[PDB]
A = this chain, B = another copy of it.
Amino acid sequence: RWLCIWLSDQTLEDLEKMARREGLSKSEMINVALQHYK
Contacts and interface: CB of A to CB of B under 8 A. Distances in A.
Interface of A: 1-12, 14-15, 18, 25-38
Contacts of A1: 6-9, 12
> Among A6, A18, A35, which residue has the most Cβ atoms of chain B within 10 A?
A6
Main secondary structure of the interface of A (DSSP, over half): helix
- This chain: how many copies in the complex? 2
Nearest to A6: B27
A7 B35 CA distance: 11
10 contacts: A2-B5, A4-B4, A7-B31, A11-B31, A12-B31, A30-B30, A32-B37, A36-B36, A36-B37, A37-B37
Contacts of A3: 4-5, 7, 12, 26, 30
